[PDB]
């Protein structure tokens, strides 16, 4: 048996956003609940934590989220709440209900993505990569640049190399390689095809010498 | 708020090799009701922790038994008794015993494989970029071990810090490197006003930084 968060999404810094987390079957609904989040490619930071009714629903918080986040819970429903208000940038993260049957922060869901931004669906600039101003190998690449939301694909038309995104001043960034025998480049056509599905663009660019 | 320090941030093991982890703590993990609430999750690739061990030694429902965990009070260690393919992500401790409830940076259990130097390619901004007013100059720097590098950009000569936006991928599926993508941005204007443009990389596999540069003016 186990938990199944929902209720995050895109929201404006803030904002404010209510997070629900379901138990599964068993059979108790004594036992305490927690809330645990984590950035993009960052560590796990704890936020919350409500006891069950015998314990008086005791909440605590981390110092992050005080007087800004409440955690709370309906035991009729089978619910634990996450009530996020005055909503910030760094409140970005996957956030996580995090419990035990008797074995502490044992059962983890999938999680439920918040993102905090100002942000605008933003159709990516797609730059060629080519050298230069003479070996076996050639590498070539596109710069995939100023995007919202998230998803962009690179596909190279496999030693491709796809590097994560980076968040710039409210806008993605990403950038892919191909490398590729000399004997194929410039003498055939090497393109990469960039879709972005949110802004509806799909990029072709062949790389020219 | 209870400081919960890893060592060590980074382990390169073989597959079948033991390894072990350490956890370490700001003050005692002991509860006044006499327990021990320092717990191990592994997180892997795309996922969500999973529980290992939890107060300290206790093995979670179906973890493997090549999983254990040792210490006492402030003193941490999680061993791996043969690492196996599946074991690889991110390893946490994590402490319940004092509020805020807190966790250690991670560490991450990565492939052992030999020292490879990286391929660097640097690239001019694009005629596409130029139009627009922009100027984006990027380096590759593409299949090296261990993953430790640092990349300089030099505009004619000087280091330049402002502009710069660095992308590391994890270690590959096949032959288990570390590749890099670093580019200096300014304006079309800016570009235009200068014209050696050079990124250096420095890496365990010389002692002589990596330079890569193009002059603009040529290009």
């Known amino acids: 048996v186990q938990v199944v968060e929902s209720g995050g999404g895109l929201v404006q810094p803030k904002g404010s956003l209510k997070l629900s987390c379901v138990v599964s079957?068993?059979?108790?609904?004594?036992?305490?609940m927690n809330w645990v989040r984590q950035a993009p490619g960052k560590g796990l930071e704890w936020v919350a934590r409500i006891r069950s009714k015998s314990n008086n629903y005791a909440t605590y918080y981390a110092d992050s989220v005080k007087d800004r986040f409440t955690i709370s819970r309906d035991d009729s429903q089978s619910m634990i709440y996450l009530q996020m208000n005055n909503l910030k940038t760094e409140d970005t993260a996957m956030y996580y209900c995090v419990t035990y049957g008797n074995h502490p922060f044992a059962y983890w869901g999938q999680g439920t993505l918040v993102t905090v931004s100002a942000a605008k669906t933003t159709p990516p600039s797609v730059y060629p990569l080519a050298p230069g101003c003479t070996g076996s190998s050639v590498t070539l690449g596109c710069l995939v640049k100023g995007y919202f939301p998230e998803s962009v694909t690179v596909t190279w038309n496999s030693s491709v190399h796809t590097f994560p995104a980076l968040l710039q001043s409210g806008l993605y960034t990403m950038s892919s390689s191909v490398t590729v025998p000399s004997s194929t480049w410039p003498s055939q056509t090497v393109t990469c095809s960039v879709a972005h599905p949110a802004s509806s663009t799909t990029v072709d660019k062949k790389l020219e010498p | 708020d209870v400081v919960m320090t890893q060592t060590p941030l980074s382990l390169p093991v073989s597959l079948g090799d033991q390894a072990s982890i350490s956890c370490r703590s700001s003050?005692?993990?002991?509860?006044?009701?006499?327990?021990?609430?320092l717990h191990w999750y592994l997180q892997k690739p795309g996922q969500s922790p999973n529980l290992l061990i939890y107060?300290?030694?206790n093995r979670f429902s179906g973890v493997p038994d090549r999983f254990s965990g040792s210490g006492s009070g402030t003193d941490f260690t999680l061993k791996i008794s043969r690492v196996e393919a599946e074991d690889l992500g991110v390893y946490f401790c994590?402490?319940?015993?004092?509020?805020?409830?807190?966790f250690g940076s991670g560490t991450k259990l990565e492939i052992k494989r030999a020292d490879a130097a990286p391929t660097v390619s640097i690239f001019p901004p694009s005629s596409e970029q130029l139009t627009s007013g922009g100027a984006s100059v990027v380096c590759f720097l593409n299949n090296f071990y261990p993953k430790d590098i640092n990349v300089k950009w030099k505009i004619d000569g000087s280091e330049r810090q402002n502009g710069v936006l660095n992308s590391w991928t994890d270690q590959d599926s096949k032959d288990s490197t570390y590749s890099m993508s670093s580019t200096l941005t300014l304006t079309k204007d800016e570009y235009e006003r200068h014209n050696s443009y050079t990124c250096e990389a420095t890496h365990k596999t010389s002692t002589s930084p990596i330079v890569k540069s193009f002059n603009r003016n040529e290009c």
């Open positions: 994590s402490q319940s015993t004092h509020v805020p409830f807190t």
């Open positions: 003050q005692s993990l002991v509860h006044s009701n006499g327990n021990t609430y």
């Open positions: 079957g068993s059979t108790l609904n004594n036992y305490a």
């Open positions: 107060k300290v030694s």
